[PDB]
């Protein structure tokens, strides 16, 4: 009932561009929006993947494997699902598994993969697949995960119990410029509400 | 050990600006990032709020109150938690209850409120509080909720049972294409994952 009329390039970087979006509202009136888009999408179903890595161990509660990373847009460190762009010709599942191993060293198994879901629709067209990945933490390869030799990134790995995720997130994040990712927190919230 | 070095304005719009961010990695090397920022943040705890509205009625499943609206950056419709900017001097909780009532007509009670969390930390500094808000659907107030939408806003309200959220989201999307918000999906996903 609403439709895009035109989208005009305002400013383009290497990774991200800014667009003026002209669209029609249901009354037939023309309106505008400032839209942020990534420049790196080609034939992918979404810009990237977020990985929900479930560390499964027979002697432990399931943990969610999270990464702590400096994020320049945030001017501080962030606790996130392992995440990254889907490479050209790569599947969400493949990107998820690769990205998990690159960032954490864990070798996971696909559990499930979401449709493309939007990161911040009121602002950007950015989408990810949320790929749930199980990690056999008792398997010897996963005994001591190494974020797979060189990477170029500086990533601390954090494993938090699934049954206490939200509280463990709040605890971590009170100390300064360390922010929880919104999706991580949404996930944590539902774990808490569901019990 | 990592910190923002300089922030260079590339392009500033009314709602959103685009910056090239120079930061110091642990190696002592300077790197750049393209960062998106909202222009509308003031002296706030976060830019805005997302509301997780749990519609509660005796002898009924809890429902999650979601909103559907055309999102120009997505050039299509998205299913989201009610969300909007925190006004000046406003609390996250107050913004949440206000935003919930504006979009859905529901008058809710604060259940809990998150710290500021990142909408998309790899791209923007955008933060929200995720505010869980319970709605007594048996109260006369909420018998007949009336949205009070803003000039430009056209918001459809969709209430999905909490106990079957992920499926009902899928069901919605099968009926016709829309994008589910990532925070909504993360929430829905965790409801199934819980335990
Ligand atoms: C922090 C946060 C979290 C979730 C949602 C929001 C948000 N949703 N809408 C707005 C504000 N907004 C309005 N209005 C409220 C009219 N118009 C807008 C915008 C807008 O942001 N842009 C980028 C625009 O281009 N136009 C035209 O903010 C903000
Ligand atoms: C879709 C999605 C969802 C969640 C996280 C990401 C993401 N996180 N990092 C990247 C890729 N990236 C890299 N690298 C992987 C080096 N560098 C970057 C970027 C980058 O996006 N920008 C905006 C940049 O400015 N520089 C410098 O993508 C992508």
Short mmCIF file of N, CA and C and ligand atoms in Angstrom, two decimals, chain A residues 32-35 120 122-123, chain B residues 15-16 38 47-49 71 83-85 119 126-128 153 183, ligand 1:
data_model
loop_
_atom_site.label_atom_id
_atom_site.label_comp_id
_atom_site.label_asym_id
_atom_site.label_seq_id
_atom_site.Cartn_x
_atom_site.Cartn_y
_atom_site.Cartn_z
N UNK A 32 9.74 11.54 2.21
CA UNK A 32 11.15 11.19 2.11
C UNK A 32 11.66 10.50 3.36
N UNK A 33 12.77 9.80 3.19
CA UNK A 33 13.44 9.13 4.29
C UNK A 33 14.93 9.18 4.02
N UNK A 34 15.72 9.27 5.08
CA UNK A 34 17.15 9.14 4.94
C UNK A 34 17.50 7.68 5.21
N UNK A 35 18.07 7.02 4.21
CA UNK A 35 18.32 5.59 4.33
C UNK A 35 19.79 5.26 4.24
N UNK A 120 18.16 -2.68 11.37
CA UNK A 120 17.63 -1.41 11.84
C UNK A 120 16.83 -0.77 10.71
N UNK A 122 14.28 1.18 10.49
CA UNK A 122 13.92 2.59 10.55
C UNK A 122 15.04 3.47 10.05
N UNK A 123 16.17 2.85 9.70
CA UNK A 123 17.37 3.58 9.32
C UNK A 123 18.12 2.95 8.15
N UNK B 15 18.35 13.36 10.05
CA UNK B 15 18.19 12.31 11.05
C UNK B 15 19.47 11.53 11.23
N UNK B 16 20.22 11.41 10.15
CA UNK B 16 21.39 10.54 10.13
C UNK B 16 22.57 11.22 9.45
N UNK B 38 22.98 8.71 14.27
CA UNK B 38 21.79 9.54 14.25
C UNK B 38 22.19 10.92 14.75
N UNK B 47 19.57 6.48 22.02
CA UNK B 47 18.77 7.19 21.02
C UNK B 47 17.28 6.97 21.20
N UNK B 48 16.90 5.73 21.44
CA UNK B 48 15.49 5.38 21.51
C UNK B 48 15.19 4.17 22.36
N UNK B 49 13.98 3.65 22.18
CA UNK B 49 13.55 2.45 22.87
C UNK B 49 12.89 1.50 21.89
N UNK B 71 8.82 0.40 5.69
CA UNK B 71 10.10 0.96 6.09
C UNK B 71 10.88 1.32 4.84
N UNK B 83 8.81 1.04 18.46
CA UNK B 83 10.08 1.69 18.71
C UNK B 83 10.08 3.12 18.23
N UNK B 84 10.88 3.95 18.89
CA UNK B 84 10.97 5.35 18.54
C UNK B 84 12.01 6.04 19.40
N UNK B 85 12.31 7.29 19.04
CA UNK B 85 13.27 8.08 19.79
C UNK B 85 12.82 8.36 21.21
N UNK B 119 22.00 -1.08 18.05
CA UNK B 119 21.13 -1.52 16.97
C UNK B 119 21.92 -2.30 15.92
N UNK B 126 24.03 3.71 16.97
CA UNK B 126 22.63 3.74 17.38
C UNK B 126 22.38 2.78 18.53
N UNK B 127 21.75 3.30 19.58
CA UNK B 127 21.45 2.49 20.74
C UNK B 127 19.99 2.62 21.12
N UNK B 128 19.47 1.60 21.78
CA UNK B 128 18.14 1.65 22.33
C UNK B 128 18.14 1.02 23.70
N UNK B 153 3.02 8.50 10.03
CA UNK B 153 3.02 7.09 10.43
C UNK B 153 1.73 6.34 10.15
N UNK B 183 15.76 -8.15 16.02
CA UNK B 183 15.56 -8.23 17.47
C UNK B 183 14.31 -9.05 17.78
C1 LIG C 1 16.68 4.95 18.00
C2 LIG C 1 15.59 4.50 17.29
C3 LIG C 1 15.21 3.17 17.39
C4 LIG C 1 14.12 2.70 16.68
C5 LIG C 1 13.41 3.57 15.86
C6 LIG C 1 13.79 4.90 15.75
C7 LIG C 1 13.10 5.73 14.97
N1 LIG C 1 12.06 5.41 14.21
N2 LIG C 1 11.66 6.44 13.64
C8 LIG C 1 12.45 7.42 14.04
C9 LIG C 1 12.38 8.90 13.69
N3 LIG C 1 12.01 9.37 12.29
C10 LIG C 1 10.93 10.07 11.88
N4 LIG C 1 9.77 10.44 12.49
C11 LIG C 1 9.43 10.12 13.89
C12 LIG C 1 8.86 11.26 11.69
N5 LIG C 1 11.05 10.33 10.59
C13 LIG C 1 12.22 9.87 10.19
C14 LIG C 1 12.84 9.29 11.22
C15 LIG C 1 14.05 8.75 11.02
O1 LIG C 1 14.69 8.21 11.92
N6 LIG C 1 14.62 8.80 9.80
C16 LIG C 1 15.96 8.20 9.59
C17 LIG C 1 13.99 9.37 8.77
O2 LIG C 1 14.51 9.41 7.66
N7 LIG C 1 12.78 9.91 8.97
C18 LIG C 1 12.07 10.56 7.85
O3 LIG C 1 13.33 6.98 14.90
C19 LIG C 1 14.88 5.37 16.47
#
